[PDB]
Design a protein around this ligand. Structure first.
Ligand SMILES: *[C@](O)(C(=O)NC1CC1)[C@H](C[C@@H]1CC=NC1=O)NC(=O)[C@H](CC1CCCCC1)n1cccc(NC(=O)OC(C)(C)C)c1=O
Ligand SMILES: *[C@](O)(C(=O)NC1CC1)[C@H](C[C@@H]1CC=NC1=O)NC(=O)[C@H](CC1CCCCC1)n1cccc(NC(=O)OC(C)(C)C)c1=O
Lengths: 306, 306
């Protein structure tokens, strides 16, 4: 038992991290097969960043304007292309530590592991969620650009995030591994801000199931609710509306615990209306929304503490 | 910016994890050079566990009563010895992925990364603290025995924890890599329980410094306090007494933020007496005690958001 924000083991990803330099700018890139991926703003200086024209900044570079380092070893770049907001650098060596991998675009509310890196050197790993407002509440300092987010399924690494920038509120924005931003953000220094966020309702419910699997039932009640009565309360508390799809996703957990989804919703509505009264759930005094239903089944016992 | 419970990248440790079987019991072990370390209770069956005599249970095993698997590859055991609550299995192959490493016994209040493993396969990584009561609030299911805790300094892995058991409250107990238990616990099924825990005062203070480095000052005040006046309040709130040594450790953070330690103590005393009033610090509504002063300097900017 116990319940912790757990990250995926980071080994398969550590073996892919490199340093990419272009003039004065050093950041991290990702080395799979004979390609190195990195944020395209590695070609920018400070002043370039107010209003960069990337096509224009890139045409005046060569293969040799990019220095790639895997630990000690310099890698020779022999090709370059822009893909959306990344650069693809073709390199003379295939990464021998290339894991089985895929590139996925994760959906808001989904979770992944971030390997925070500086100068191609991994410094730390943590789990976080794609917020409904398409940001992440990361921990990132200068030099962290190029750090990746990923999930692991069996032996297959699903890369889903590359870090690009911090927004004014201190939250983080970036791209999938095709270089498309998550959210409405662009890779220029402008007046852009995180949209208003909302609580991930499906995750809070998954975590209440986690708390019951772990043998805690204090916050349950004898009431039920309609979806629509739940959603009127959800809106007032800045929670995402629950849908039948989200009710269907909570099925397995519902069955494992024998608590119907709409009963757990009655419990949540009561938790939202009456607070927790200095009480805790799985050690927390707030309602946690950065665990998916999949994260709960992954980490929890397949047999309830009844 | 941002602040997250960050773990060390787990790669160096993943490459050391193996499966150890003895009759019916399978758990994890750690393969450095030509030794495999694992909990000694791997030689026990269910009934053995009420009152095992390990010396007696071990003398009736041979080298070949132990099956060691590194992925596919079976390793041949050619030696065995008990060291306190571990077994050392000498093995015919030196682990080629052996990192530079050390074995340390960490002190209560210190933090480390756990690589949760099942059947020698790493499943997840998370950060936690050695509690003053010598337990950890881990996340561990059946099969997790042998999972290790570690810190990384440059390229050197400091192993400090091996998992052995869950106590009645759902918290976890285990040994250093010499097989000495942390706390008063023994590797038998008896009526043993976690002692009463206390909040790690030094860590809470380090985390308030983190919140100020990150540009939040709301909870500060114009008061100061004596150590002794602080400690009278600490005792009533089940916080550890603060000492001059702990004041000295907070020096660097004190200087980086220009807030004197006893002023931050006045802030904490006020936070303890008056609660937070639905306010947050680095996103939390409770006072966090699982970051050391070292963890804060590691993760935070070396320049304050003034
Ligand atoms: C990234 O480029 C990087 O690390 N590059 C290596 C040379 C160092 C950084 C990483 C940021 C910085 C702090 N945490 C991070 O996440 N990215 C940037 O600095 C941003 C550069 C981008 C260039 C093109 C895309 C848009 C910007 N960048 C630039 C300017 C301002 C911010 N954020 C910011 O001003 O900080 C706070 C919220 C306002 C105080 C930014 O990320
Ligand atoms: C460990 O031996 C293991 O995983 N072995 C592989 C064959 C599976 C487990 C891991 C525990 C179980 C659940 N989470 C974990 O941390 N360790 C044990 O099961 C304990 C065996 C020890 C044998 C010698 C040392 C003392 C016990 N063990 C045995 C009995 C009871 C508990 N805990 C317990 O009863 O659970 C809760 C708190 C009471 C509900 C225990 O860990």
């Amino acid at each position: 038992s116990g319940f912790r924000k757990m990250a995926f083991p980071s080994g398969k990803v550590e073996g892919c991290m490199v340093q990419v330099t272009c003039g004065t700018t050093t950041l991290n890139g990702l080395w799979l097969d004979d390609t190195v991926y990195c944020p395209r703003h590695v070609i920018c200086t400070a002043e370039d960043m107010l209003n960069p024209n990337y096509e224009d900044l890139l045409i005046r570079k060569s293969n040799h304007s990019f220095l790639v380092q895997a630990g000690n070893v310099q890698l020779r770049v022999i090709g370059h292309s822009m893909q959306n907001c990344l650069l693809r650098l073709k390199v003379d060596t295939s990464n021998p530590k290339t894991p089985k991998y895929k590139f996925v675009r994760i959906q808001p509310g989904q979770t992944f592991s971030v390997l925070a890196c500086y100068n191609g050197s991994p410094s730390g790993v943590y789990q976080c969620a794609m917020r409904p407002n398409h940001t992440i509440k990361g921990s990132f300092l200068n030099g962290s650009c190029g750090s990746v987010g990923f999930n692991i399924d069996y032996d297959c690494v699903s890369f889903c995030y590359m870090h690009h920038m911090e927004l004014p509120t201190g939250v983080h924005a970036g791209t999938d591994l095709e270089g498309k931003f998550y959210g409405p953000f662009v890779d220029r220094q402008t007046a852009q801000a995180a949209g208003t966020d909302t609580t991930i309702t499906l995750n809070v419910l998954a975590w209440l199931y986690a708390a019951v699997i772990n043998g805690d039932r204090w916050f349950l009640n004898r009431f039920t609710t309609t979806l629509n009565d739940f959603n009127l309360v959800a809106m007032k508390y800045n929670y995402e509306p629950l849908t039948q799809d989200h009710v269907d996703i909570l099925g397995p957990l519902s069955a494992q615990t024998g608590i119907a989804v709409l009963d757990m919703c009655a419990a949540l509505k009561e938790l939202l209306q009456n607070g927790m009264n200095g009480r805790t759930i799985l050690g927390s005094t707030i309602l946690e929304d950065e665990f998916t239903p999949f994260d709960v089944v992954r980490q929890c016992s397949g047999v309830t503490f009844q």
